[PDB]
Design a protein around this motif. Structure first.
Motif, PDB file in Angstrom:
ATOM      1  N   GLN A 161       0.631  -1.413   0.237  1.00 28.58           N
ATOM      2  CA  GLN A 161       0.107  -0.044   0.198  1.00 28.58           C
ATOM      3  C   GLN A 161       0.886   0.950  -0.304  1.00 28.58           C
ATOM      4  N   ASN A 162       0.739   1.784  -0.798  1.00 27.61           N
ATOM      5  CA  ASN A 162       1.680   3.471  -0.897  1.00 27.61           C
ATOM      6  C   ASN A 162       3.008   3.061  -1.240  1.00 27.61           C
ATOM      7  N   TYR A 163       3.107   1.527  -1.948  1.00 31.17           N
ATOM      8  CA  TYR A 163       4.619   2.029  -2.368  1.00 31.17           C
ATOM      9  C   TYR A 163       5.130   1.509  -3.187  1.00 31.17           C
ATOM     10  N   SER A 164       5.461   2.350  -4.159  1.00 30.44           N
ATOM     11  CA  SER A 164       5.966   2.702  -5.463  1.00 30.44           C
ATOM     12  C   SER A 164       7.094   1.480  -5.958  1.00 30.44           C
ATOM     13  N   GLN A 218       7.457  10.108  -4.044  1.00 32.54           N
ATOM     14  CA  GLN A 218       6.153  10.009  -3.957  1.00 32.54           C
ATOM     15  C   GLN A 218       4.900   9.275  -2.656  1.00 32.54           C
ATOM     16  N   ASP A 239       5.767   8.609   0.532  1.00 39.28           N
ATOM     17  CA  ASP A 239       5.928   7.551   1.036  1.00 39.28           C
ATOM     18  C   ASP A 239       6.136   8.011   2.338  1.00 39.28           C
ATOM     19  N   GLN A 241      -4.953   4.563   5.354  1.00 38.64           N
ATOM     20  CA  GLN A 241      -4.894   5.150   4.161  1.00 38.64           C
ATOM     21  C   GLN A 241      -5.599   6.340   4.909  1.00 38.64           C
ATOM     22  N   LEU A 286      -2.456   7.735   6.037  1.00 41.16           N
ATOM     23  CA  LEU A 286      -1.645   8.122   4.571  1.00 41.16           C
ATOM     24  C   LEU A 286      -2.203   9.620   4.379  1.00 41.16           C
ATOM     25  N   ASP A 287      -3.146   9.882   4.608  1.00 41.10           N
ATOM     26  CA  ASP A 287      -4.631  11.478   3.582  1.00 41.10           C
ATOM     27  C   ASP A 287      -3.936  12.427   4.828  1.00 41.10           C
TER      28      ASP A 287
END
Ligand SMILES: CCc1cccc(CC)c1O
Ligand SMILES: CCc1cccc(CC)c1O
Lengths: 168, 168, 168, 168
Positions: B5-8, B119, B121, D107, D110-111
Motif C-alpha cells: 500500500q502506497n509503496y511505489s 512519491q 511515502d 489510507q 496517509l491522507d
C-alpha cells in the motif's frame, strides 16, 4: 615396555631431542627476561613478556615428557646449552632473536610431525597438532605483530619506552 | 501483494539497490579490518574499528531487507562487487577511504529520502530518518574527528602507533 | 612475510577461494531467509533457520581470514556472486538447495585438506578438522533429517505448516 | 485557543474523523472477538487476537484525542456505526475483513499525513509517523502472514483448529 604400541624408536628419540630444544628455549627466555630487568635496561614489560615465555616453553617440555612416558618411551636428558648471547641489545634485537628461536622450534615440531606421519603414528600427530602446532603459529604471529610495531616506532629511545608502556 | 500500500515500484527498486550498497560497504570494511590484522601492518585498534563497521553495515542491509518485506516489496539481490583496493595503505589512507565510502552511502540515503518524499511515502521517509540518517551523520563526524587527529599526529610511524593505542 | 613458514602459495590461494565460497554461501542463506519472511510465504521458523546459517557461514569466512593472516598469507577478495535463485519455492525445495550448497562447501573443505596433506601442512589440516569438517558433517546430517521429515509430511500445505511449527 | 499555533481547521477536523475511524475499528474488533468466543465457533486464540486489537485501536483513538487537545483543537464526537457484519464466518473470512479494515485506517493516516504536509504542520506529520504509520505497516504485515498460513491450511476444519492452536 608392557604398554608400548606403535611407538617407533625414531619418534622416541626425536621426542627426547624436542624436550631438549624446549628446555633450551625456556633457558634462552629466562636470560632474555633477566637482561631486561637490568637497571641499565629497565623495560619491565619486556622482562615479563620473556619470563612468561620461559614458563610456557618449560610447560611444553613437561607435556612432551609426560607423553613420552604415556607411550612407553624412555626420557633421556642431555646438557642444556647456554643461550646464544649474554646481552640481548634492544627490544627490537631481542624480538628478532625470539622469532628466530620460535621458527626453529616450529620447524622441529613440523619435522617430528612428518616423522610421525611416515611412521603411521596418529597419536603422535594428533598430540603435536592439538598442543603445540597452533600455539606456535599464534605466538609467531604475535611476535611478528610486535616486531612491526617496534620497527614503526624506532627517535629510538622514545619508541622503545612507548612500546613497552603501551603494548606490553 | 495483499499487503502492499502506497509503496511505489521506484522505491522498491531503490531499496534493493541500497541493500547492495550497504552489503558492499560491509565487504569493504571486512577487507579493511583484515588488512590491519596483517602481521606487517599490525594495528589491532584499527582492525577492530573497521570490523565493527562491517557488522554495522551488514545490520543496516538486513533492516532494509526486513522493511522491504514489511512493505510488500520483493528483495532482489545482485552481485557484491569486491572492494576497490586489496591493500589500504596507512591508517590515514584507510580513514580517508572510509569517509568517502560513508558520504556515498549518505548520499544514497538522501536520494532515497527525496524519492520517498516525491512519491508521498512517509513511512519510507520516517524509516530512513529514524534508523539511518542520524547514524550516518554521527559516524561521519566521528571519522572526521579521527582524520583530524591522525593528521595532527603524522614522525609518521610514532603518530600511527599512538593514535591506535590511545584513541582506538 | 617475516612469519610465514611451511605455508605454500597453493594453500594460500585455495584459502582465499574458500573464503569466497563461504561468503557466497552466507549470501545465499540471507536470500533464503528473507524469501521465507515474505508475507506470501510466511514461514518464520524456516526464515530463522536460514538466517542463522547465514551468520554461521559468515563466521566461517572470518575464521579462515584470521587463519590466513596467522600464517602470513594475504587475503584477496573477489566479487561475491548473487545467489542462484531469486525465489526459492517450497521448504522442501529450499532444504534440497541448502544440502546441495553444503555438500559443495564440504567438498571444497575436503579438497583443501587433501592439498594441505600433499603439501605436508599439518597446521592447515588440523585447522580444517577442528573447526569445519565436523561442523559440516553435523549440519548435513541435520538437513538430511529435515528433508526426510519434510518429505514424509508432503496434503502439502498442512505438512509445510506443521514442519515449520513443530520442528523449526 | 491561547495555545493554538500552526494548527489548521482542516487538520483539526480530519483528526476528529480519524478518532471516529479508530473507535469504529475498535468496535468492529470487539464484535469479531466475541463472535469467536461463541460456543458454536469456539476459537479462543482468534478471539484473543481480535480483542487485543480492539484495545489497540481504542488506545490509538485516545492518543489522537490527547494530541487534539495538546494542539488546541476541539474534540467532536460522532455516532459510532455498528460493525459491517453480525457474524464473521471462518478465521480466513475474519482475517480478510481485518486486513481490509486496517488498509482503510492506513489510507486515512496517509491522507492526514498528506494534509499535514500541505498545511506545513510538521508536528502533525511527526506525530503520525512516530505513533501510527509504522504500527499499521507492522500490523498489516502480520495479518498478511496470517492470511497466507490460514490459506495454506484450508481439510478446512482441521486447518482452522491447527492455526488457532499453533499460531495464535
Ligand atoms: C559482515 C561480512 C559481510 C560482508 C559483505 C557481504 C556479506 C553478505 C552477508 C557479509 O556477511
Ligand atoms: C474497546 C471497546 C470499544 C469499542 C468501540 C468504542 C468504544 C468507546 C470507548 C469502546 O470502548
Amino acid at each position: 615396555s608392557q604398554i608400548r604400541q606403535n611407538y617407533s624408536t625414531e619418534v622416541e628419540a626425536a621426542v627426547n631431542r624436542l624436550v631438549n630444544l624446549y628446555l633450551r628455549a625456556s633457558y634462552t627466555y629466562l636470560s632474555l627476561g633477566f637482561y631486561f630487568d637490568r637497571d641499565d635496561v629497565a623495560l619491565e614489560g619486556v622482562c615479563h613478556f620473556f619470563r612468561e615465555l620461559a614458563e610456557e616453553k618449560r610447560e611444553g617440555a613437561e607435556r612432551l615428557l609426560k607423553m613420552q612416558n604415556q607411550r612407553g618411551g624412555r626420557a633421556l636428558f642431555q646438557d642444556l646449552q647456554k643461550p646464544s648471547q649474554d646481552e640481548w641489545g634492544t627490544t627490537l634485537d631481542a624480538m628478532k632473536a625470539a622469532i628466530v628461536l620460535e621458527k626453529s622450534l616450529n620447524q622441529a615440531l613440523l619435522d617430528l610431525h612428518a616423522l610421525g606421519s611416515a611412521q603411521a603414528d596418529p597419536h603422535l600427530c594428533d598430540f603435536l597438532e592439538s598442543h603445540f602446532l597452533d600455539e606456535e603459529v599464534k605466538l609467531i604471529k604475535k611476535m611478528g605483530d610486535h616486531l612491526t610495531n617496534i620497527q614503526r616506532l624506532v627517535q629510538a629511545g622514545l619508541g622503545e619506552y612507548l612500546f613497552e608502556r603501551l603494548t606490553l
